[PDB]
Structure 1
Amino acid sequence: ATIGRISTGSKSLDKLLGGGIETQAITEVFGEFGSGKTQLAHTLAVMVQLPPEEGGLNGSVMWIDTENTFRPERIREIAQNRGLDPDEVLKHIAYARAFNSNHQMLLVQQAEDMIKELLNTDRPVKLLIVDSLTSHFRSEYIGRGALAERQQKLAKHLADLHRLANLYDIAVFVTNQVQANGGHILAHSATLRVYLRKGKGGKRIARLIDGEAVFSITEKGIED
């Protein structure tokens, strides 16, 4: 397949990305609590359902939640203000809550069955979200003695996600909380790393790790 691109809602961030987030890739966004990673995830789940003339891919969505942070009312607000029907948008998002890190690993395997089901329809899966990818692993494996086991399990989970992205032409989008009092970047595993932070007057600022884009959080999700 050719490489597909999903607009983020912001022309500034799209330019930084070369057009938007790519299919056949894992995109990792990281930053402090409150920086807006989950608002970017909600915006993409709506943007992907637009036609290509408007920056979408006529796609279906699959969402794995680890912290109870998905909000259908927020999805309805973004859709209504992007000219789509809110009921139709929610109908094409498949949602599951991960109980712990082992169950989170099984949910990715289960996702592959719905992906095959939709593959030859007019609304195939084009976006897979994991928010938050690291939270269960961090709280379950504490200490230096337990680090090697935590890294083993994380490495396998990332390889599972890479396989789905490439075999089925899907954009994988994952969030990771990193601050002074805890949190670790996924080293070199994702295809692309994006650093997110809050600036003066509630502007959000993004930079590619290995110029900068600037945007706001609004009724449209995010915009310049």
Structure 2
Amino acid sequence: GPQPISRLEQCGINANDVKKLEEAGFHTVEAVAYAPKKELINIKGISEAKADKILAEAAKLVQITTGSKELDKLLQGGIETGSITEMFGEFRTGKTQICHTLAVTCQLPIDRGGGEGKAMYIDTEGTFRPERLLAVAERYGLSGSDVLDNVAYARAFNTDHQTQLLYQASAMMVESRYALLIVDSATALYRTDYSGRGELSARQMHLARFLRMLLRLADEFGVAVVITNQVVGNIIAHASTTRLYLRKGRGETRICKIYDSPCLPEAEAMFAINADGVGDAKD
């Protein structure tokens, strides 16, 4: 399991540097331990000696239904909890709609295709609609009020705030059972904030660390990690376990394709976006 980074402070790292590591997004001794010097050195106010002391002392201690049956079959029954699933597609393909649907379906009983856990929606694009969550809840006969009470929401204004919310998510996810973490327009802040060309490596490093934190949180809490990508990077490939390509069919009916999964076939399924739901295509 995890080894929360608090224990690293008893090794004699000072607590301020541990706070800087938590701000960076390292929350376990496992997390600090299996990384090279440069990760800790790149943090502001950390020299090579402090990074070597951290690594040295760290080595001492150490299926959610989509609600579309065709899509569930495409996924062999739904998202695997504990792993990151990326859905990349054009704008208006229904990524946000799928997120809203899953934010409620996660709360469904496991026998009903849920995870019996609360949902987490981190929004960067303003598209969060509690009324859509209410619609999905009424679709499955779930209490809309309890759905909104079991979904904690916060809009990230920048990449630093986007990573900082993970610090609150890790501590908050310990007290209550969650099953779904949603990050909508996850890549948008890396394009709007970091727009220059010399700063590309900085946003790539921040994204890499963010993805590693996502995988860490997935393995730590056994929750589903959902991130949304606008396709107007090869780094996500090794990190994402299931890549879904979304494209528009005219009207409100969307085509979904699987474009990489080591376990799931590359395959396609047709679905629609209905007021209640993300739901099977009904010609």
Cα RMSD of the aligned pairs, angstroms, is: 1.4
Distance 1:187 1:83 in 2: 36
Distance 1:56 1:178 in 2: 29
Match of 2:112 among 54, 68, 71: 54
Moved more, 169-178 or 197-206: 197-206
Aligned counterpart, 1:121: none
**SS of residue paired to 1:67:** coil
Q: Which protein, 1 or 2, shows the higher relative CO under an 8 Å CA cutoff with sep ≥ 6?
A: 1
**SS of residue paired to 1:76:** helix
Distance 2:193 2:275 in 1: 36
- 1:129 positional shift: 0.6
* Cα deviation digits, residues 101-157 of structure 1 (max 9, x gap): 101111011101111111xxxxx1111110011111111222332211111111001
Tell me, yes or no, if structure 1 residue 106 matches structure 2 residue 164: yes
* Cα deviation digits, residues 169-195 of structure 1 (max 9, x gap): 11001111111xxxx563432111111
Tell me, yes or no, if structure 1 residue 194 matches structure 2 residue 244: yes
- 1:220 positional shift: 2.2
Amino acid at match of 1:175: T
Distance 1:176 1:25 in 2: 16
Aligned counterpart, 2:216: 163
TM-score when scaled to structure 2? 0.72
Distance 1:176 1:30 in 2: 5
Distance 1:74 1:116 in 2: 27
Moved more, 187-196 or 64-73: 187-196
Q: For residues 31-110 of structure 1, what are the structure 2 equivalents within 5 Å?
A: 31-110=89-168
Structure number with greater Rg is 2
Distance 1:97 1:141 in 2: 18
Distance 2:115 2:187 in 1: 28
Distance 1:220 1:11 in 2: 15
Distance 1:62 1:31 in 2: 22
Distance 2:108 2:81 in 1: 15
- 1:209 positional shift: 1.2
Match of 2:66 among 8, 16, 26: 8
Distance 2:195 2:131 in 1: 36
- 1:62 positional shift: 1.2
The structure with the largest strand share of the pair is 1
* Cα deviation digits, residues 17-72 of structure 1 (max 9, x gap): 11101111001111111110000000001111111121112111111010111101
Distance 1:94 1:31 in 2: 26
Distance 1:16 1:144 in 2: 38
Distance 1:10 1:161 in 2: 25
Match of 2:187 among 130, 134, 137: 134
Amino acid at match of 1:62: M
Distance 1:145 1:205 in 2: 37
Equivalenced residues, count: 212
TM-score when scaled to structure 1? 0.90
Q: Which runs of 5+ in 2 are unaligned?
A: 2-62, 261-266
Contact 1:61 1:94 in 2 (8 A): yes
